[PDB]
Amino acid sequence: KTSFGSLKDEDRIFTNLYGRHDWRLKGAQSRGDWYKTKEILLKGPDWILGEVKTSGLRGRGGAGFPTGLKWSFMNKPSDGRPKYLVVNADEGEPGTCKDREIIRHDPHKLVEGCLVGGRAMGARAAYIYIRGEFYNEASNLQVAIREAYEAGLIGKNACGSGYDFDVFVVRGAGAYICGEETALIESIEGKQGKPRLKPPFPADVGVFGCPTTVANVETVAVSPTICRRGGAWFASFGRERNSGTKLFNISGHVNNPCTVEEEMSVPLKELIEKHAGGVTGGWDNLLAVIPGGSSTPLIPKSVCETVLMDFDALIQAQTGLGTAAVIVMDRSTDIVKAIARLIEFYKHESCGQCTPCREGVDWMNKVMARFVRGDARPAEIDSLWEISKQIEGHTICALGDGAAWPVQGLIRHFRPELEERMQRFAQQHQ
């Protein structure tokens, strides 16, 4: 196919996304959930991983790793230790609230995804790490898990298969760095949420020292629909190596911010003008677009017109898809203040274990505050770029890269505004 977008309503995986049906077991089973799951559990982990590999499903957390290879990293014999599948539901990334809607409205899809993923790698039990502030969503998930346990779907002889399974929920304590998989693994174990170094990878040494596979909410909940509908159906959408459907959160200076399921290769402008109502003041009132939240650099209107919102095309556009969160800023926005607020958010949310992030994020916060006040020199700006090059690639986890990227994008795409601001401050105050 050449023109993408405009996903059909019958091909949308996440039905009852807006909460227009019942979220309990009766509403879940009347929409197509928990159908022939016993055959899925009986056909074998190799068959399940083959169906995942045929679909071409990639990591929806924000890194875009192939889910088939990562899930096949556990296809090894047991060594006297159990195996665990952990579903990441921290949701600390600004601009992204799709997994909150998935948990609050369709929890049984997530539970069936946990069971299918646990059988797919021989996991003894599943843990779900939810945010501390998501008390009502955690309570809804607990109600759904209790109704699944009481109906014999999971527990002893789960879904009439002979392979037992347990699903747990562990509530967080309000930390963004706990969204990282190794910091999440450490936070489950009662330690502080500080990430580990890889190697050892979590597939070898994870939670409690046992083998552990950490996966996003939507890349887990899609898997029952992958195993039921088929590999070719899920691989038909989008370009090659970018297959599937994605939940896009459009927010910012838009008339109707929302969360919408769409095909992968939908253009940005078409998606905004169709599923969100367009930018206030017209499309020509657009100034900047953040494509996937705080972990990717912004792009201007000159490139946003003809860009494709998948991994490869946005990587070619010197940015990243990330969590697919379209933040929109129009021409009436002080984007220096927006990047300063983003860097201050990173300053307030940083685990501080490894020193380059721990010092350079506060350094960037001070430099951005001086830039907002305009008390800066032009020769400082390139130095700031060099500071980013001392953070990107020298950190334990990827929060340092996610801190260096928005400043690099802001400099690269809006240097004349920064020079104008500092020249204006120098002309006025001196």
Ligand X SMILES: Cc1cc2nc3c(=O)[nH]c(=O)nc-3n(C[C@H](O)[C@H](O)[C@H](O)COP(=O)(O)O)c2cc1C
Ligand Y SMILES: NC(=O)C1=CN([C@@H]2O[C@H](COP(=O)(O)OP(=O)(O)OC[C@H]3O[C@@H](n4cnc5c(N)ncnc54)[C@H](O)[C@@H]3O)[C@@H](O)[C@H]2O)C=CC1
Rounded to whole angstroms, how far apart are CA atoms 372 and 253? 21
For position 143 contacting other proteins by CB under 8 A, the verdict is no
The DSSP 8-state label assigned to residue 260 in this structure reads E
For position 201 contacting ligand Y by CB under 6 A, the verdict is yes
Angstrom CA distances, 291 to 97, 119, 164, 324, 361, stand at 14, 35, 41, 6, 22
For position 55 contacting ligand X by CB under 6 A, the verdict is no
For position 180 contacting ligand X by CB under 6 A, the verdict is yes
Least distance from C-beta 183 to ligand SF4, angstroms?
7
Least distance from C-beta 92 to ligand Y, angstroms?
6
Among 61, 94, 211, 231, binds ligand X (CB under 6 A): 61
The site string for ligand X over 372-411 (x = CB under 6 A, - otherwise) reads -------------------------xxx------------
Which of ligand X, other proteins, ligand SF4, none does residue 256 bind (CB under 5 to 8 Å by kind)? other proteins
Two tokens, residue 312: 């490869």
Among 44, 132, 162, 393, binds other proteins (CB under 8 A): 132
Give the residue among 356, 292, 283 at the shortest CA–CA distance from 325.
292
Site for other proteins in 44-63 (CB under 8 A): none
In the chain, what's the furthest Cα-to-Cα distance?
79
Which of other proteins, ligand Y, ligand SF4, none does residue 65 bind (CB under 5 to 8 Å by kind)? ligand Y
Closest CB to ligand SF4 among residues 295, 353: 353
Per CB under 6 A, residues contacting ligand SF4 are 177, 195, 350-354, 357-358, 395-397, 399-400
Least distance from C-beta 310 to other proteins, angstroms?
20
Closest CB to other proteins among residues 267, 313: 267
Q: Which stretch binds ligand Y (CB under 6 A): 54-62, 225-233, 256-264, 328-336?
A: 54-62
Q: Which stretch binds ligand X (CB under 6 A): 90-98, 202-210, 252-260, 358-366?
A: 90-98
Q: Hunting for tokens 């939670």 — which residue is that?
A: 207
Sign, CA dihedral 388-343-324-137, equals: positive
Q: Are 413 and 376 in contact (CB under 8 A)?
A: no
Question: Which ranges of 212-334 does DSSP label H, i.e. alpha helix?
Answer: 217-229, 231-236, 268-275, 301-304, 311-316
For 283-379, list the strands marked E by DSSP: 286-290, 299-300, 325-330
Rounded to whole angstroms, how far apart are CA atoms 71 and 49? 7
Least distance from C-beta 58 to ligand X, angstroms?
7
Task: Report the Cα 15 to chain-centroid distance in Å.
Answer: 20
